[PDB]
Design a protein around this nucleic acid. Structure first.
Ligand code: HPA
Ligand code: HPA
Lengths: 338, 338
DNA sequence: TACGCAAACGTTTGCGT
DNA sequence: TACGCAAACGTTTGCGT
């Protein structure tokens, strides 16, 4: 079809191309003629013809886990902004933590020759680490590890541990000593790492967490619902709960409410993520904020770099969580004794 | 690179191609040889070379509005599933209701030669209708109109009006006569249409909605927060509120709570959307359910059809909302008198 | 000066044999 | 029998003039 434009304007295709991309000087008249032809013919240059020739698609691949979840959804929306801004195209892919699904999306991606790869798989068993290596040739950044588990990718790190410790500390400082915890999947950074940060703050404080006070969640509201229940559904119960993700938290608030428990009056709750509408939880949620956008933009950035500046050496940038006081926590019995 | 495989296996490229796509019979040995070469060379066939030749990218474009919002997020996640299943690729694009952004994504898309287009723009001013027409050549379905506003696309319709009427009715039947409403943007189907369905149910019931009881929202929790406030922040106040979107609802619950109002005891609330975690609102939200996935799959389907079966004539499938009783509503003063 | 030539990018697929 | 030939898809870009 570029050929069709050329001839309407009676110039070579080279000419047409150049005008379209301002890639060399073209007489005004010539330039107009082309634009004109371009207009009538209603011409849309093919990006595929072009990618074929130039060797880059100017499109990037996001190999995610899931995309509905607030946490995720929030990141992803940031990532798209960045692509758009730098004229990249976003191919969103959810592998649902399924290897097969993951090998699949992976290959489609390479086939579609994405300039780079954004990775958000949540859990990294060896097999997955393995596959990934198989594509080291395609530049990519992992956005969800706590440390850098490989030398063949960039990593943006969140300090999940330090956020976890921040949480316990707060409780402690608010007069609390009988606490529970509903962590997310241990096979995840945001799961294992937050918990550990949190557990450290406890040991330092000589506070012990009775195993009946720790209940595993899966980051979904139902999981929070069940745990909260299980925790409060017991003889002796904590006065405060550390909940590993705001959504699970929302589920824990529901249950308390359902058992007719008062928050924070009867139980204090601290979440983690500071999702866009945690302030609208009832009550407004006190939580740990994760810099979602910085998280996004930052990764998009390392990628671009490796892409354009052809970096070769793995890099890794840290990001920092931070406390956000809202109204789900109340002073504990030991407040005054400090 | 296909050339490199050919020669390692000492067969023509045609051969290589055929084996790769099982497109004609190939001797076993030959077939193996190729696979072998394919393996060592670590070959990834280029989809772009292929798309160039075959004339279709096997990738689809979602021109959305925003993607964080629960409602949206939910749809989109469904759409991806479908693409994946039928081996399509999803290019997610958010135009944020901005024309420029929209003309932009639109063109990038055509350039990338997407097989079809999924449209979710929320608001359709003429200019936008205009642009869209300019691409009638690319098959597309609009997933967010109440009726079919053009003859050059497929439309999947939700019966937003009938859901709105369902809502009012319920209130009415629960003993309510003093009701308020926080609608979403009138420039939208889910805004205008829900409200109107709702207003019809009222007129039929000879219930009048004092303009001070109707407050515009924008589908965001803050908007619900403000409206609820404004409504209850008044001398005389309704006993029940119809809130146009679950998220805005969540914001309305917060405020009530903040003014120390009891739900549903002091005020009853009915939402709309039945978002994945409306059951975890506190209290569990009574709302109107929108068939999000059917919504997604269904559109993906008309698209595919038009794509493959080369349909040419516009089509339109309706979908149906439905009531979901949870615990945010309570009997009204007129219950017994019916 | 301001532009055109033709090879090249990586596959597919209608004829042949 | 089981496979190879060469044109074609739609751009880009190094030489020339
Ligand atoms: O894996 C996760 N899923 C959902 N929300 C989350 N917030 C932190 N980690 C996660
Ligand atoms: O436009 C909308 N935005 C967000 N949520 C919604 N739910 C229905 N319509 C909408």
């Amino acid at each position: 079809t570029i050929k069709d434009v050329a001839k309407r304007a009676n110039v070579s295709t080279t000419t047409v191309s150049h005008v379209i991309n301002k890639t060399r000087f073209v007489a005004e008249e010539t330039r107009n003629a082309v634009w004109a032809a371009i207009k009538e013919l209603h011409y849309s240059p093919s990006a595929v013809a072009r990618s074929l020739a130039v060797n880059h698609t100017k499109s990037i691949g996001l190999l995610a886990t899931s995309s509905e979840a607030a946490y995720f959804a929030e990141i992803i929306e940031a990532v798209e902004k960045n692509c758009f801004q730098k004229g990249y195209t976003l191919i969103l892919g959810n592998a649902w933590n399924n290897l097969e699904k993951q090998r699949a999306y992976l290959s489609m991606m390479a086939q579609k020759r994405v300039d780079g790869l954004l990775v958000m798989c949540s859990e990294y068993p060896e097999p997955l680490l393995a596959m990934l290596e198989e594509y080291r040739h395609i530049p990519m950044v992992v956005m969800d590890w706590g440390e850098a588990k490989a030398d063949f990718t960039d990593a943006v790190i969140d300090n999940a541990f330090e956020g976890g410790y921040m949480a316990g500390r707060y409780l402690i400082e608010r007069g609390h000593r009988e606490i529970g915890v509903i962590p997310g999947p241990l096979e995840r950074n945001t799961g294992a790492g937050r918990l550990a940060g949190f557990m450290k703050a406890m040991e330092e404080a000589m506070i012990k967490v009775p195993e009946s006070w720790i209940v595993q969640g899966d980051f979904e509201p139902e999981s929070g619902y069940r745990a909260m229940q299980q925790i409060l559904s017991q003889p002796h119960r904590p006065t405060a709960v550390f909940c590993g993700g705001d959504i699970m938290a929302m589920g824990a608030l529901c249950a308390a409410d359902e058992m007719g428990l008062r928050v924070p009056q009867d139980v204090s709750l601290i979440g983690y993520d500071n999702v866009r509408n945690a302030r609208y939880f009832t009550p407004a949620l006190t939580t740990i904020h994760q810099p979602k956008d910085s998280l996004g933009e930052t990764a998009f950035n390392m990628l671009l770099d490796r892409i354009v500046n052809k970096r070769e050496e793995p890099q890794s940038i840290e990001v920092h969580p931070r406390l956000i006081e809202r109204r789900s926590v109340a002073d504990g019995p030991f407040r005054d004794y400090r």
